[PDB]
Amino acid sequence: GAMAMAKARKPREALLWALSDLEENDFKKLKFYLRDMTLSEGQPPLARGELEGLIPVDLAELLISKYGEKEAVKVVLKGLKVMNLLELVDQLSHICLHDYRE
């Protein structure tokens, strides 16, 4: 509330830039367990190149389509929390409606 002079941003682009703002050995760790349960598969096995080699707009677009763009973004932050990735998540969350997740 109050302060902060930043125009409107893009939510979808926030997930791509955020998920990429973290190391592959991080996003995968969460998606490995978080997605495993929260979601019902829909991607290849262990692959650190999924983030480093490939791109976020590619892996993200597939994830959002897997179960949904909604829980998709949440699956990133929700699992990123236990990782202490509040650094970049600070905005991403406030840009994807963190209120949706506890």
Coordinates of N, CA and C in Angstrom, one line a residue:
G1 N 0.8 -1.2 0.0 CA 0.0 0.0 0.0 C 0.8 1.3 0.0
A2 N 0.5 2.2 -0.8 CA 1.2 3.5 -0.9 C 2.6 3.3 -1.4
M3 N 3.2 4.3 -2.0 CA 4.5 4.3 -2.5 C 4.6 3.3 -3.7
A4 N 5.8 3.1 -4.2 CA 5.9 2.2 -5.4 C 5.3 2.8 -6.6
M5 N 6.1 3.3 -7.6 CA 5.6 3.9 -8.8 C 5.9 3.0 -10.0
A6 N 5.2 1.9 -10.2 CA 5.4 1.0 -11.3 C 4.1 0.7 -12.1
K7 N 4.1 0.9 -13.4 CA 3.0 0.7 -14.2 C 2.6 -0.8 -14.2
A8 N 1.5 -1.1 -14.9 CA 1.0 -2.5 -15.0 C 2.0 -3.4 -15.7
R9 N 2.1 -4.6 -15.3 CA 3.0 -5.6 -15.9 C 2.2 -6.8 -16.4
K10 N 3.0 -7.7 -17.0 CA 2.4 -9.0 -17.5 C 2.5 -10.1 -16.6
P11 N 1.4 -10.8 -16.2 CA 1.4 -11.9 -15.3 C 2.1 -13.2 -15.9
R12 N 1.7 -13.5 -17.1 CA 2.2 -14.7 -17.8 C 3.7 -14.5 -18.0
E13 N 4.2 -13.4 -18.4 CA 5.6 -13.1 -18.6 C 6.3 -13.1 -17.3
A14 N 5.6 -12.9 -16.2 CA 6.2 -13.0 -14.9 C 6.6 -14.4 -14.5
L15 N 5.9 -15.4 -14.9 CA 6.2 -16.7 -14.6 C 7.4 -17.2 -15.4
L16 N 7.5 -16.8 -16.6 CA 8.6 -17.1 -17.5 C 9.9 -16.5 -17.0
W17 N 9.8 -15.2 -16.6 CA 11.0 -14.5 -16.2 C 11.4 -15.0 -14.7
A18 N 10.4 -15.3 -14.0 CA 10.6 -15.8 -12.6 C 11.2 -17.2 -12.6
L19 N 10.5 -18.1 -13.2 CA 10.9 -19.5 -13.2 C 12.4 -19.6 -13.8
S20 N 12.7 -18.6 -14.6 CA 14.1 -18.6 -15.2 C 15.0 -17.9 -14.3
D21 N 14.5 -17.1 -13.4 CA 15.3 -16.3 -12.4 C 16.0 -17.2 -11.4
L22 N 15.6 -18.5 -11.4 CA 16.1 -19.5 -10.5 C 16.9 -20.5 -11.2
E23 N 17.8 -21.2 -10.5 CA 18.7 -22.2 -11.1 C 17.8 -23.5 -11.4
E24 N 18.2 -24.2 -12.5 CA 17.5 -25.4 -12.9 C 17.4 -26.4 -11.8
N25 N 18.5 -26.4 -10.9 CA 18.5 -27.3 -9.8 C 17.6 -26.9 -8.7
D26 N 16.9 -25.8 -8.9 CA 15.9 -25.3 -7.9 C 14.5 -25.5 -8.4
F27 N 14.2 -25.0 -9.6 CA 12.8 -25.1 -10.1 C 12.4 -26.6 -10.3
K28 N 13.4 -27.4 -10.7 CA 13.2 -28.8 -10.9 C 12.9 -29.5 -9.6
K29 N 13.6 -29.2 -8.5 CA 13.5 -29.8 -7.2 C 12.0 -29.6 -6.8
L30 N 11.5 -28.4 -6.9 CA 10.1 -28.1 -6.5 C 9.1 -28.9 -7.5
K31 N 9.2 -28.7 -8.8 CA 8.4 -29.3 -9.7 C 8.4 -30.8 -9.6
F32 N 9.6 -31.3 -9.1 CA 9.8 -32.7 -9.0 C 8.8 -33.3 -7.9
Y33 N 8.7 -32.6 -6.8 CA 7.8 -33.1 -5.7 C 6.5 -32.4 -5.8
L34 N 6.5 -31.0 -5.8 CA 5.3 -30.2 -5.8 C 4.4 -30.6 -7.0
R35 N 5.0 -30.6 -8.2 CA 4.3 -31.0 -9.4 C 3.8 -32.4 -9.4
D36 N 4.8 -33.3 -8.9 CA 4.5 -34.7 -8.8 C 3.1 -34.9 -8.1
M37 N 2.9 -34.3 -7.0 CA 1.6 -34.4 -6.3 C 0.6 -33.4 -6.8
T38 N 0.9 -32.1 -6.6 CA 0.0 -31.1 -7.0 C -0.6 -31.3 -8.4
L39 N 0.3 -31.7 -9.3 CA 0.0 -32.0 -10.7 C 0.0 -33.5 -11.0
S40 N -0.4 -33.9 -12.2 CA -0.3 -35.3 -12.6 C 0.6 -35.5 -13.8
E41 N 1.9 -35.5 -13.5 CA 2.9 -35.7 -14.6 C 2.6 -34.8 -15.8
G42 N 3.2 -35.1 -16.9 CA 3.0 -34.2 -18.1 C 4.3 -33.7 -18.6
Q43 N 5.4 -34.2 -18.1 CA 6.7 -33.7 -18.6 C 7.7 -34.9 -18.5
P44 N 8.9 -34.7 -19.1 CA 10.0 -35.7 -19.2 C 10.6 -35.9 -17.8
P45 N 11.5 -36.9 -17.7 CA 12.2 -37.2 -16.4 C 13.2 -36.2 -16.1
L46 N 14.1 -36.5 -15.1 CA 15.1 -35.6 -14.6 C 15.8 -35.0 -15.8
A47 N 15.8 -33.7 -15.9 CA 16.5 -32.9 -17.0 C 16.8 -31.5 -16.6
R48 N 18.1 -31.2 -16.2 CA 18.5 -29.9 -15.8 C 18.5 -29.0 -17.0
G49 N 18.5 -29.5 -18.2 CA 18.5 -28.7 -19.4 C 17.1 -28.1 -19.7
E50 N 16.1 -28.6 -19.0 CA 14.7 -28.1 -19.2 C 14.6 -26.6 -19.0
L51 N 15.5 -26.1 -18.1 CA 15.5 -24.7 -17.8 C 16.7 -24.0 -18.4
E52 N 17.9 -24.6 -18.2 CA 19.1 -24.1 -18.7 C 19.2 -24.2 -20.3
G53 N 19.0 -25.4 -20.8 CA 19.1 -25.6 -22.2 C 17.9 -25.0 -22.9
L54 N 16.7 -25.4 -22.5 CA 15.5 -24.9 -23.2 C 15.1 -23.5 -22.7
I55 N 13.9 -23.0 -22.9 CA 13.5 -21.7 -22.5 C 12.3 -21.8 -21.6
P56 N 12.1 -20.7 -20.8 CA 10.9 -20.6 -19.9 C 9.6 -20.5 -20.6
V57 N 9.6 -19.7 -21.7 CA 8.3 -19.5 -22.5 C 7.9 -20.8 -23.1
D58 N 8.8 -21.8 -23.2 CA 8.5 -23.1 -23.8 C 8.1 -24.1 -22.8
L59 N 8.9 -24.2 -21.7 CA 8.5 -25.1 -20.6 C 7.3 -24.6 -19.8
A60 N 7.2 -23.3 -19.7 CA 6.1 -22.7 -19.0 C 4.8 -22.9 -19.7
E61 N 4.8 -22.6 -21.0 CA 3.6 -22.7 -21.9 C 3.1 -24.2 -21.8
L62 N 4.0 -25.1 -21.7 CA 3.6 -26.5 -21.7 C 3.0 -26.9 -20.3
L63 N 3.6 -26.3 -19.2 CA 3.1 -26.6 -17.9 C 1.7 -26.0 -17.7
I64 N 1.5 -24.8 -18.1 CA 0.2 -24.1 -17.9 C -0.9 -24.9 -18.7
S65 N -0.5 -25.5 -19.8 CA -1.4 -26.3 -20.6 C -1.7 -27.6 -20.0
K66 N -0.7 -28.1 -19.3 CA -0.7 -29.5 -18.7 C -2.0 -29.6 -17.8
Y67 N -2.0 -28.8 -16.7 CA -3.1 -28.8 -15.8 C -3.8 -27.4 -15.8
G68 N -3.1 -26.3 -15.9 CA -3.7 -25.0 -16.0 C -2.7 -23.9 -15.7
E69 N -2.9 -22.8 -16.3 CA -2.0 -21.6 -16.2 C -2.1 -21.1 -14.7
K70 N -3.3 -21.3 -14.1 CA -3.5 -20.8 -12.7 C -2.6 -21.5 -11.8
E71 N -2.9 -22.7 -11.4 CA -2.1 -23.5 -10.4 C -0.6 -23.6 -10.9
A72 N -0.4 -23.5 -12.2 CA 0.9 -23.5 -12.8 C 1.8 -22.5 -12.0
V73 N 1.5 -21.3 -12.1 CA 2.3 -20.2 -11.5 C 2.5 -20.5 -10.0
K74 N 1.3 -20.9 -9.4 CA 1.3 -21.1 -8.0 C 2.3 -22.3 -7.6
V75 N 2.3 -23.3 -8.5 CA 3.2 -24.4 -8.2 C 4.7 -24.0 -8.2
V76 N 5.0 -22.8 -8.8 CA 6.3 -22.3 -8.8 C 6.7 -21.6 -7.5
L77 N 5.8 -20.7 -7.1 CA 6.0 -19.9 -5.9 C 5.9 -20.8 -4.7
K78 N 4.7 -21.5 -4.6 CA 4.5 -22.4 -3.5 C 5.7 -23.3 -3.2
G79 N 6.3 -23.9 -4.3 CA 7.4 -24.7 -4.1 C 8.7 -24.0 -3.9
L80 N 8.7 -22.7 -4.4 CA 9.9 -21.9 -4.3 C 10.1 -21.3 -2.9
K81 N 9.0 -21.2 -2.2 CA 9.0 -20.7 -0.8 C 9.9 -21.5 0.1
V82 N 9.7 -22.8 0.1 CA 10.5 -23.8 0.9 C 11.9 -23.7 0.4
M83 N 12.2 -23.0 -0.7 CA 13.5 -22.9 -1.3 C 14.2 -21.6 -0.9
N84 N 13.4 -20.7 -0.3 CA 13.9 -19.4 0.1 C 14.1 -18.5 -1.1
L85 N 13.4 -18.7 -2.2 CA 13.5 -17.9 -3.4 C 12.6 -16.7 -3.4
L86 N 12.4 -16.2 -2.2 CA 11.5 -15.0 -2.0 C 12.2 -13.8 -2.7
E87 N 13.4 -13.9 -3.1 CA 14.1 -12.8 -3.7 C 13.4 -12.3 -4.9
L88 N 13.3 -13.0 -6.0 CA 12.6 -12.6 -7.2 C 11.1 -12.9 -7.1
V89 N 10.8 -13.9 -6.3 CA 9.4 -14.2 -6.1 C 8.6 -13.1 -5.5
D90 N 9.3 -12.2 -4.8 CA 8.7 -11.0 -4.2 C 7.7 -10.4 -5.1
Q91 N 8.2 -10.0 -6.3 CA 7.3 -9.4 -7.3 C 6.4 -10.5 -8.0
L92 N 7.0 -11.4 -8.6 CA 6.2 -12.5 -9.3 C 4.9 -12.8 -8.5
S93 N 5.1 -13.0 -7.2 CA 3.9 -13.4 -6.4 C 2.9 -12.2 -6.3
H94 N 3.4 -11.0 -6.1 CA 2.6 -9.8 -6.1 C 2.1 -9.5 -7.5
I95 N 2.5 -10.2 -8.4 CA 2.1 -10.0 -9.8 C 1.2 -11.1 -10.3
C96 N 1.2 -12.3 -9.6 CA 0.3 -13.4 -10.0 C -0.8 -13.6 -8.9
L97 N -1.0 -12.7 -8.1 CA -2.0 -12.8 -7.0 C -1.6 -13.8 -6.0
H98 N -0.6 -13.5 -5.1 CA -0.2 -14.5 -4.1 C -1.3 -14.8 -3.2
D99 N -2.3 -14.0 -3.1 CA -3.5 -14.2 -2.2 C -4.1 -15.5 -2.6
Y100 N -3.9 -16.0 -3.8 CA -4.5 -17.3 -4.3 C -3.8 -18.5 -3.5
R101 N -2.6 -18.3 -3.1 CA -1.9 -19.3 -2.4 C -1.5 -18.9 -1.0
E102 N -1.5 -19.9 -0.1 CA -1.2 -19.6 1.3 C 0.3 -19.4 1.5

